[PDB]
From a paper:
TRAF7 is a noncanonical member of the TRAF family, with a long CC domain and distinct WD40 repeats instead of the TRAF-C domain. Somatic mutations within the coiled-coil (CC) domain and WD40 repeat domain of TRAF7 could cause brain tumors, while germline pathogenic mutations contribute to severe developmental abnormalities.
As predicted, TRAF7 CC forms a parallel CC trimer in the crystal, and residues E285–L377 exhibit distinct electronic cloud density and form coiled coil. Using the multi-angle light scattering (MALS) assay, we demonstrated that both TRAF7 CC and TRAF7 ZF-CC (fragment 221–379 aa) independently form trimers in solution. Detailed structural analysis revealed that TRAF7 CC comprises 10 regular heptad repeats and one hendecad repeat interspersed between the heptad repeats. The helical diagram analysis revealed that the residues at the a and d positions of the heptad/hendecad repeats of TRAF7 CC (residues in yellow in Figure 4A) are predominantly hydrophobic residues, which are mainly responsible for forming the folding core of the trimer. Charge residues in the e and g positions further stabilize the CC structure by shielding the hydrophobic core from the surrounding solution. MALS assays showed that the L322R and L347R mutants displayed significantly lower molecular weights than the wild-type TRAF7 CC. MALS assays revealed that K346E exhibited a lower molecular weight compared to the wild-type TRAF7 CC, while R371G did not present a significant difference in molecular weight, suggesting a weakened stability of the TRAF7 homotrimer caused by the K346E mutation. The results showed that the Q310L mutant behaved similar to the wild-type TRAF7 CC, while the elution peaks of the F337S and I368S variants were shifted to the right, suggesting weaker interactions between the chains of the trimer, indicating that the F337S and I368S variants likely form the trimer with lower structural stability, ultimately affecting TRAF7 function. In conclusion, our results showed that TRAF7 CC region formed a stable functional trimer in solution, and the formation and stabilization of the CC trimer are crucial for zebrafish embryonic development.
Numbering used by the authors:
A (entry chain C): 285 to 376
B (entry chain A): 285 to 377
C (entry chain B): 286 to 377
């Protein structure tokens, strides 16, 4: 007869599973939070990139407009040069 | 024979464990798909960033090349004025 | 004697331990993928720091060149007026 010790052996086994499950709840919770930290880090990095990009886009536009404007001044200077070279051959 | 209710108590606990495990299957399934979306999102940002820098680098190169030609045109032009100024002191006055 | 059922529960506990053992694997991989992705982000942040400081200097260095070159353009335009003014002193 007897065999009543086995009743506790399964009761003990269920405690092992509850403890092992309790870690599983724990491990998943971090992975969730760790994932959230990365998605937050990425989204904020995206925001700083948009600003830092809009700045360099504006600077590229201001400098490139200046470059094209200076091409006009080269033509205006060249126009005045054609007049002068013709004028010097009009007399010593 | 003195506690047959325990026969059912274990059947209840096994059901608790199966559902609790079923949750773990779901949480990992969600975590897996969410992870894949992030790894894809990261991959797309890497590619789009490569372009926008390669784009602006071309503008920086073409704009700086424009400067180098314009300094040359300015240097030859400044030479052209110095030669002219030298001729003016040789002219009758 | 209900000894057939006592083993039936022992079998189910083995099923769960295997299912738990898989969960350890799935969590371990997901952990590493997070570390790899979080690693991918950090190098991307650093690479942006370098690539931005370069282009920011190039925009500043080129724009400083513009400011010097616009000065040189004004001196050139003055000397053309200088030459034309001397030619108008030959008439007079």
């Amino acid at each position: 007869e007897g065999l009543k010790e086995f009743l506790q052996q399964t009761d003990d086994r269920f405690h092992e599973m509850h403890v092992a499950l309790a870690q599983k709840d724990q491990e998943i919770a971090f992975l969730r939070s760790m994932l959230g930290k990365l998605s937050e880090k990425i989204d904020q990095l995206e925001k700083s990139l948009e600003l830092k990009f809009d700045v360099l886009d504006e600077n590229q536009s201001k400098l490139s407009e200046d470059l094209m404007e200076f091409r006009r001044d080269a033509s205006m200077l060249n126009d005045e040069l054609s007049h002068i070279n013709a004028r010097l051959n009009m007399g010593i």
